[PDB]
């Protein structure tokens, strides 16, 4: 089997993209949020405290004939960014782009925090890192993945993210008319539970290439690229004014500016980000002071490749035995 599904963006930043997903019979339709930086298939829902859903579209398993509590399993997370959700656990039949999955564990929420209460766009999140970090409980549940894996015509998915447009994420096959050149695969490690690689390097605009293993994640559920200070310092002393804030939260530049391209490396292959890319927009309404696309990870722990540099990609999430994961330029 396969799927096939239109990923789009939220906004006119790319802040997240939004993927619609079939849950229950008769379906229902929630746009989630498909994040390979985490596991868990959360959804707004009927018993989501009321307070705390302000325009999202909920699920509501009562009125799903073949929705099934799971007893006693609960779960709660908390994500990079400090937000955080928690609720009980149903299983059900879960169709992405047409590939169906039966028995998906479908996390329910009863709250979720203000994050997402705020977010009208985002009806939840589709977790597809490995299924580790999974955190129901007291039984760890399967993401969506998983569960189709062993159906699939090959074990892998790809995400196809647009720049200011929709892309596509597609399941069970690799769609050789979606990108240029060739695909350079790279190795993964999965200790974390991530979908965690090593960059062998970077360059700022035109500028010589700087070999240097950069380990990271490939995270499409964080907006932008997160990477070390000394990397995002490079970056952005290439553009006049630019300059860290620390009221505002990381790197600001004028938005008079024309911003350099940043390349990263994956083998001896090439990945460019256009400057364009790399421009996320005043900082408040009106401001001419604008917040930048490529941010220190040093607070985080960990190098992120979020949709930034994913989006200048079509990126292959092989879930082989062995994962490896796979860049080409599109």
Do not use: M
């Amino acid at each position: 089997s396969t799927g096939s599904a239109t990923t789009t963006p939220i906004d006119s930043l790319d802040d997240a993209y939004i993927t619609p997903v079939q849950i229950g019979t008769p379906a229902q339709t929630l746009n989630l949020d498909f994040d390979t930086g985490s596991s868990d298939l959360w959804v707004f829902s009927s018993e989501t405290t009321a307070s705390e859903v302000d325009g999202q579209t909920i699920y509501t398993p009562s009125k799903s004939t073949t929705a099934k509590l799971l007893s006693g399993a609960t779960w709660s997370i908390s994500y990079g960014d400090g937000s955080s959700s928690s609720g009980d656990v149903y299983t059900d039949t879960v169709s992405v782009g047409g590939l169906t999955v039966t028995g998906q564990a479908v996390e329910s929420a009863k709250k979720v925090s203000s994050s997402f209460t705020e977010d009208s766009t985002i009806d939840g999140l589709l977790g597809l890192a490995f299924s580790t970090l999974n955190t129901v409980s007291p039984t760890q549940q399967k993401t969506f993945f998983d569960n189709a894996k062993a159906s699939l015509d090959s074990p892998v998915f790809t995400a196809d993210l647009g720049y200011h447009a929709p892309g596509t994420y597609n399941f069970g096959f690799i769609d050789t008319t979606a990108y240029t050149g060739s695909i350079t695969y790279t190795a993964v490690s999965t200790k974390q539970g991530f979908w965690e690689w090593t960059s062998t390097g970077y360059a700022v605009g035109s500028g010589t290439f700087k070999s240097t293993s950069i380990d990271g994640i490939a995270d499409t559920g964080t907006t932008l690229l997160y990477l070390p200070a000394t990397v995002v310092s490079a970056y952005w002393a290439q553009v006049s004014g630019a300059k860290s804030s620390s009221s505002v939260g990381g790197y600001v530049f004028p938005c008079s500016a024309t911003l350099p391209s940043f390349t990263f490396g994956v083998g001896s292959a090439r990945i460019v980000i256009p400057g364009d890319y790399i421009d996320f927009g005043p900082i408040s309404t009106g401001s001419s002071s604008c917040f930048g696309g490529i941010q220190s990870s040093a607070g985080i722990g960990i190098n992120i490749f979020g949709d930034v540099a994913l989006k200048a990609a079509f990126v292959v999430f092989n879930g082989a035995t062995t994962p490896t994961l796979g860049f080409a330029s599109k």
